[PDB]
Amino acid sequence: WRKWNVKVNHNEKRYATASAIAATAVASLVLARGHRVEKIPEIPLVVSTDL
Amino acid sequence: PSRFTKTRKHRGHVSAGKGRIGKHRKHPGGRGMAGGQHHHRINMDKYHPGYFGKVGMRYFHKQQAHFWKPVLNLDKLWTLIPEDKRDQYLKSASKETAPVIDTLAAGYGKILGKGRIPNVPVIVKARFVSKLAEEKIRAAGGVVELIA
Amino acid sequence: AISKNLPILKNHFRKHWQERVKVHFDQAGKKVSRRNARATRAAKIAPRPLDLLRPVVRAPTVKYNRKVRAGRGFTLAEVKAAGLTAAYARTIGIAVDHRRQNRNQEIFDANVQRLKEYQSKIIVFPRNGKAPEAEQVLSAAATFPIAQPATDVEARAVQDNGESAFRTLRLARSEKKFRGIREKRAREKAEAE
Amino acid sequence: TVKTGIAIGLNKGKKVTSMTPAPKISYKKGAASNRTKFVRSLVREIAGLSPYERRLIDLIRNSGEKRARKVAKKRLGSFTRAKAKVEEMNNIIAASRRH
Amino acid sequence: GAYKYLEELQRKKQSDVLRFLQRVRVWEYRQKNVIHRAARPTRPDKARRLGYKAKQGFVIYRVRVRRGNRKRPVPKGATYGKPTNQGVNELKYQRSLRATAEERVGRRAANLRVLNSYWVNQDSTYKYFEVILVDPQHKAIRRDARYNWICDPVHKHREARGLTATGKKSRGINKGHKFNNTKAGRRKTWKRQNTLSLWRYRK
RNA sequence: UUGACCUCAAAUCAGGUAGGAGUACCCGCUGAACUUAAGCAUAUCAAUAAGCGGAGGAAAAGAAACCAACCGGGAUUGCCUUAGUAACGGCGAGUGAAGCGGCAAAAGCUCAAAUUUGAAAUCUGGUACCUUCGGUGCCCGAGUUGUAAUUUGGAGAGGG
RNA sequence: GUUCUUUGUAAAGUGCCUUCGAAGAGUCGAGUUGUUUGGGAAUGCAGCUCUAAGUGGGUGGUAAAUUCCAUCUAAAGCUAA
RNA sequence: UUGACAUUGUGAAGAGACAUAGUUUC
Ligand SMILES: [Mg+2]
Ligand SMILES: [Mg+2]
Ligand SMILES: [Mg+2]
Ligand SMILES: [Mg+2]
Ligand SMILES: [Mg+2]
Ligand SMILES: [Mg+2]
Ligand SMILES: [Mg+2]
Ligand SMILES: [Mg+2]
Ligand SMILES: [Mg+2]
Ligand SMILES: [Mg+2]
Ligand SMILES: [Mg+2]
Ligand SMILES: [Mg+2]
Ligand SMILES: [Mg+2]
Ligand SMILES: [Mg+2]
Ligand SMILES: [Mg+2]
Ligand SMILES: [Mg+2]
Ligand SMILES: [Mg+2]
Ligand SMILES: [Mg+2]
Ligand SMILES: [Mg+2]
Ligand SMILES: [Mg+2]
Ligand SMILES: [Mg+2]
Ligand SMILES: [Mg+2]
Ligand SMILES: [Mg+2]
Ligand SMILES: [Mg+2]
Ligand SMILES: [Mg+2]
Ligand SMILES: [Mg+2]
Ligand SMILES: [Mg+2]
Ligand SMILES: [Mg+2]
Ligand SMILES: [Mg+2]
Ligand SMILES: [Mg+2]
Ligand SMILES: [Mg+2]
Ligand SMILES: [Mg+2]
Ligand SMILES: [Mg+2]
Ligand SMILES: [Mg+2]
Ligand SMILES: [Mg+2]
Ligand SMILES: [Mg+2]
Ligand SMILES: [Mg+2]
Ligand SMILES: [Mg+2]
Ligand SMILES: [Mg+2]
Ligand SMILES: [Mg+2]
Ligand SMILES: [Mg+2]
Ligand SMILES: [Mg+2]
Ligand SMILES: [Mg+2]
Ligand SMILES: [Mg+2]
Ligand SMILES: [Mg+2]
Ligand SMILES: [Mg+2]
Ligand SMILES: [Mg+2]
Ligand SMILES: [Mg+2]
Ligand SMILES: [Mg+2]
Ligand SMILES: [Mg+2]
């Protein structure tokens, strides 16, 4: 009966996921994270819906 | 989490920060609220005057609900009108057409009088009213309409 | 065991309580099964919905009567008015309640109307065999939502006959408060020889 | 009834257009009936009075309705049944050893 | 019909005709064995309203149980304990004599299921009962939709589980404010109010 | 003399059933003390452990002798809440539910008491056959001290 | 889904008129004892003594008498989730 | 152990009241 799960305020959960999304542009961030994106066109990388 | 806690810091110190003289033993004062009228009276009066003994009358089978009756002060009131609709009614303060506010429908029981609504006429439907709240309401050309 | 300026607590843990601790570890589990059960049933139940047609009903007590909420079933009266008998209405997916009573004509019309609409908007397949496949609406509830009735208009003229409301309440409270006594002064003054 | 339309006071409550429902038979569960009436009468005159029932009527002739009640209220449950039982006794008396 | 008269007659237990009867009969019973088969209902109208039927499958037993308090067993009165618990002699027993009656016959006829039971007579020493029973494997009962519920295994020894009418009585199974402790069935409802309910996302 | 009936027996009588086990969970009975109160007897631990009887895949409960006091609700069960509240309590230590509201699931019913009385219309069993979880014929038997049809309070029955 | 027997001079539903309308007892209830309950002039349970009625009866969380009102229909029974 | 109530019924004489007919109680 130890606590296994944690409650996060739903709003703040979104502040986080939002924040997270926003950093996936910001190429240095991406770069910093592992991820080999030197030799890619641009960031955000967007690609045909045909995918 | 364990790693941030002061017991981690006490490791290697003999007494876990509980003293060599006075130790940490099972229950020195007694357990729970023991001795409240004896060796723990000083803490009880001050911090908790009023604790022991009785006042007032018993009510067997008291069901709250019976007494449900949330209050709304004039103070707000106008908040029970959606904003768009609200400004429309503020300007054109009149008889003939004045907003109807079901405060029972807003889930209030009684209207109290905290302070100043504008001079717009309002039709106020409520179960109860404080003498003043209603006075102030009329003083802007509203009436209170008594419902249930 | 009393110290500092702390609030007095009441943590009832002096029985063998570690013996009756339920941790809903199966919260995810049940939801799924719960979901599967509905899906198995929805299928088994052919094109019928998962629920029955419930009635409108004003809530009990001083506190909730402002609201109107789904009831259990339709009362022999309502069912009758809406043009069918219960024995049948029970087979057409209408809930009937022999217990409930009619005393308010606003609600009775509401319910009868509710029944009318339901009837028109369902279709009852014949007993024969054919079973002309017709796709299930799962809810009857969603389909025929219950709503709060309109009690007034948005704006209207201010009529003030002048009588304080407040005072009417005080007076009203009063009248009841002495209602008895004055019937004793009516009984005691009647026995004036 | 009729409700006053306000939220305190004598006929406290919301005005609403009324209905008065068709009556439930289960509301006449008490009700006599020609059948039971007959049977009970007949059974009565078979088995007759019982010990405490005799004493009750002899009490009635010799000390009145008020002491009959007091005693009967001990015999039976209560003062209300005792009322009922003494009545029932008076009618045994009048109907029989009189008219 | 006759039944309505028997019914009304039985309610006059202190009637010269009924106490003649009661006295003769209570002597007859007391001579026989404490459990014994009954040829028929002595109260064909009572039996009948309690689910009895005069067809092969239905069985009546008459049984005798001692009256009075439960003397608490304990050698020499000795209770070995706090003194609220020192009582021995005014102690009552939570089940009724009717339960004990049903229980002892039901044990005596394990191949039967007990359906119900009614009081017939007492003196100072004994309360006399008649338990009505059903044979769940007699085909007259296995057919007949009205009584073959009794044939299921969930109804084995209903008398031993407080499931007959006397049972449900003392179990306190009724609706209402007066039966809060005991009605979903006391022990189960205690467990409920003494269970700690902890969620994943703690409330 | 013979034939019943009531009630009671017997059989290696024809066919069946019960026991023991398991017992996490379930329905009852019975029933502590350590402990807490800084001592202790009421209280508390606890309507708990130990002991006893009885079930199932769930058990139990269940179609209101309910809740309410409202514009009323409407079988049962459980979750969230009501609420550490109403209340109990050397009113000390401690204890402590329910009604409404949201939700999960939903589902309703059976007798007794009634003259079939122009027809016991009902049923176990044996038997022969058959399309064998059964049916039909026939025969013993049950049953009128009442087996079916009919009706269950929401009603419902008899006449027209 | 198909296919064979038509179960029937069988069964059931509904509207008006009239007369009816059977509804569980050593139980309900009461006193006392004891146990239990948050249940407080007594929450349930049991023992013993008393013991009903039929416009009756139970409940309506402060005892009692009086008058009303509300609300169900006990002392028998089955039932999935 | 002692009392009351229940198991507990049938006569007869004698006391006891409606207040010197016999239902009732020792
Ligand atoms: Mg911590
Ligand atoms: Mg850590
Ligand atoms: Mg560290
Ligand atoms: Mg250091
Ligand atoms: Mg340090
Ligand atoms: Mg260190
Ligand atoms: Mg140091
Ligand atoms: Mg320290
Ligand atoms: Mg040390
Ligand atoms: Mg020191
Ligand atoms: Mg206190
Ligand atoms: Mg404010
Ligand atoms: Mg706890
Ligand atoms: Mg402890
Ligand atoms: Mg688990
Ligand atoms: Mg559903
Ligand atoms: Mg078909
Ligand atoms: Mg036989
Ligand atoms: Mg002991
Ligand atoms: Mg005690
Ligand atoms: Mg409790
Ligand atoms: Mg937390
Ligand atoms: Mg054999
Ligand atoms: Mg066993
Ligand atoms: Mg115990
Ligand atoms: Mg311990
Ligand atoms: Mg101690
Ligand atoms: Mg200590
Ligand atoms: Mg000690
Ligand atoms: Mg206790
Ligand atoms: Mg145990
Ligand atoms: Mg098994
Ligand atoms: Mg099953
Ligand atoms: Mg299941
Ligand atoms: Mg069951
Ligand atoms: Mg019913
Ligand atoms: Mg109602
Ligand atoms: Mg309910
Ligand atoms: Mg406290
Ligand atoms: Mg407790
Ligand atoms: Mg709900
Ligand atoms: Mg069913
Ligand atoms: Mg009944
Ligand atoms: Mg006990
Ligand atoms: Mg008590
Ligand atoms: Mg009263
Ligand atoms: Mg039955
Ligand atoms: Mg059941
Ligand atoms: Mg003596
Ligand atoms: Mg004897």
Spell B49-86 as b/e; 16+ CB within 10 A means b: eeeeeeeeeeeeeeeeeeeeeeebbbeebbebbeeeee
Which helix (H) or strand (E) segment holds residue C43: the answer is helix C27-44
- Using a CB-CB distance cutoff of 8 angstroms, which residues of chain B are in contact with residue D14? 147-148
Q: Which amino acid is at C61?
A: T
CB D82 within 8 A of CB D73: yes
Q: How far apart, in whole angstroms, are the C-alpha atoms of residue D70 and residue D78?
A: 9
Provide φ and ψ at D18, rounded to 5°.
-90, -175
Chains B and C are touching, with contact defined as 3 or more CB–CB pairs separated by less than 8 Å: yes
Strand H lies under 7 A from the Cβ of residue D37: no
Which residue, chain included where needed, has tokens 């039996």?
A: E47
Instruction: Quote the tokens at residue C15.
Output: 């029985």
Among C180, C165, C100, C146, CA closest to B148: C165
Q: Which nucleotides of F are covered by protein (CB under 7 A)?
A: 6-9, 16-19, 26-34, 36-39, 41-48, 53-62, 64-88, 91-115, 122-125, 141-148, 153-155
**Using CA atoms, how far apart are residues E171 and E181, in angstroms rounded to an integer?**
10
* Rounded Cα–Cα distance for residues E79 and E66 (Å): 24
- Surrounding ion ligand 6 within 5 Å at CB are B 12
**What three-state secondary structure class fits D1?**
coil
Q: Decide if E68 contacts E122 (C-beta within 8 A).
A: no
**Integer Cα distance of C71 and C54 in angstroms:** 6
Partners of residue B146 in chain D, C-beta under 8 Å: 5-7
C69 neighbors C59 (Cβ within 8 angstroms)? yes
Q: B107 with B70: CB under 8 angstroms? A: yes
Binding-site residues on chain C for chain B (CB distance < 8 A): 1-6, 8, 61-63, 66, 151-160, 164-166, 168-169
Dihedral (CA of E2, E7, E8, E12) sign: positive
C1/B48 touch (CB, cutoff 8 Å), yes or no: no
SS3 at position C107: helix
B102, two tokens: 């079901």
Contacts of C24 in chain E (CB under 8 A): 197-200
Backbone angles phi, psi at C22, to 5 degrees: -100, 120
Nearest CA-CA partner of E68 in E122, E14, E23, E32: E122
Q: Which residue spans within chain C are E strands per DSSP? A: 21-23, 155-156
Nominal resolution (angstroms) = 3.0
By C-alpha to C1' distance, G33 is nearest to: E90
Ramachandran angles phi, psi of C167, nearest 5°: -60, -40
Interface test with chain E among C11, C15, C20, C23, by most E beta carbons within 10 Å: C20
- Chain B CB contacts of D9 under 8 Å are none
Distance between terminal CA atoms of chain C? Answer: 74
CB atoms within 10 A of CB B5: 9
Within C99-139, residue ranges assigned H as helices are 105-121
Q: Is the CB of E39 under 7 A from strand F?
A: yes
Give yes or no for CB of D18 within 7 Å of strand G. Answer: no
Among E7, E23, E13, E118, which Cα is nearest to E63's?
A: E118
Is the CB of D80 less than 7 A from some atom of nucleic acid strand G?
yes
Angle of helix C166-177 versus helix C179-188 axis, rounded to 10: 50
3-state secondary structure of C58: strand
Conformational region of residue E141, where left means phi above 0, alpha means psi within -120 to 50, and beta covers everything else: alpha
Peptide bond into C60 cis (omega under 30): no
- CB contact set of B120 (below 8 Å; sequence gap of 6+): B89, B90, B93, B98, B140, B142
Residue E191 is which amino acid? K
Task: Single out the residue of E158, E91, E94, E161 nearest to residue E131, CA to CA.
Answer: E158
Q: Burial level of C57, CB count in 10 A (0-12/13-18/19+)?
A: buried
Which conformational region is residue E129 in: left (phi greater than 0), alpha (psi within -120 to 50 degrees), or beta?
beta
Per-position DSSP letters for E93-157, written without gaps between them: -SS-HHHHHHHHHHHHTTTSEEEEEEEEEE-SSEEEEEEEEE-TTSHHHHS-TTTGGGGSGGGTT
CA gap B130, E189 in Å, rounded: 46
Distance CA C80, CA C84 (A): 5
Q: Enter the DSSP assignment of C137.
A: -
Residue C3 backbone class (left: φ over 0; alpha: ψ -120 to 50; beta: rest): beta
Query: Coil, strand, or helix at residue C181?
Result: helix
Q: Which of C20, C21, C24 sits opposite E200 (nearest CB)?
A: C24
Report the largest interatomic distance among the alpha carbons of chain D, rounded to a whole angstrom: 61
C-alpha E145: how far from chain center: 25
What interhelical angle do D51-63 and D79-93 show, nearest 10? 80
Is the Cβ pair C24, E196 closer than 8 Å?
A: no
Write down which residues 117-136 in B have CB closer than 7 A to strand F.
none
CA of D25 to C1' of F151 (A): 15
Q: Are the beta carbons of C56 and C100 closer than 8 angstroms?
A: no
CA B126 / ligand 9 centre spacing (Å): 69
Asked if B141 and B123 count as a contact pair (C-beta separation under 8 A), the reply is no
Ligand with the closest atom to the CA of D25:
36
Q: How far is CA D71 from CA C63, D84, E24, in A?
A: 49, 13, 31
Quick check: helix, strand or coil at residue A3? coil
For residue E91, give the nucleotide whose C1' atom is nearest its CA: G34
For A1, the closest chain E residue by CA position comes to: E198
**D99 token code pair:** 């008219």
Q: D76: Cβ–Cβ under 8 A, 6 or more apart, which residues?
A: D82, D85
Terminal-residue alpha carbon distance, chain D: 46
Query: What is the DSSP secondary-structure string of B85-122?
Result: HHHHHHSS--SSSEEEEETTTTT--EEE--S---S---
CA A51 from chain centre, in angstroms, equals 20
Judge if the beta carbon of E85 is closer than 7 A to nucleic acid strand F.
Answer: yes
Which of B115, B137, B116 lies closest to B125, judged by CA?
B137
D70: helix, strand or coil: helix
Question: D15-20 contacts: CB < 8 A, separation 24 or more?
Answer: D16/C104, D16/C105, D16/C106, D17/C104, D17/C105, D17/C106, D18/C103, D18/C104, D18/C105, D19/C102, D19/C103, D19/C104, D19/C105, D19/C108, D20/C103
In chain C, residues with a C-beta closer than 8 Å to the C-beta of D18 are 103-105
Tokens found for residue D54: 């005799």
Whole-angstrom distance, CA of residue C138 vs CA of residue C141: 9
Residues in chain D within 8 Å Cβ distance of C105: 16-19
Q: Do E17 and D52 touch (CB under 8 A)?
A: no
Residues E148, E141: Cα–Cα separation, whole Å: 6
Tokens found for residue C158: 């201010």
Geometric angle at alpha carbon C184, from C181 and C187, rounded to 5°: 160
Give the whole-angstrom CA distance, residue C152 versus residue C39: 43
Q: Are B127 and B110 in contact (CB under 8 A)?
A: yes
| D35, D42, D50: residue with CB nearest E15 | D50
Torsion A13-A19-A24-A28 (CA) sign: negative
Rounded distance between C-alpha atoms, residue B141 and residue C4, angstroms: 56
Structure tokens at B61: 């089978």
Specify whether the CB–CB gap between B111 and B145 falls below 8 A. no
Indicate if CB(D37) is under 7 A from strand F: no
B98: which strand partners? C156
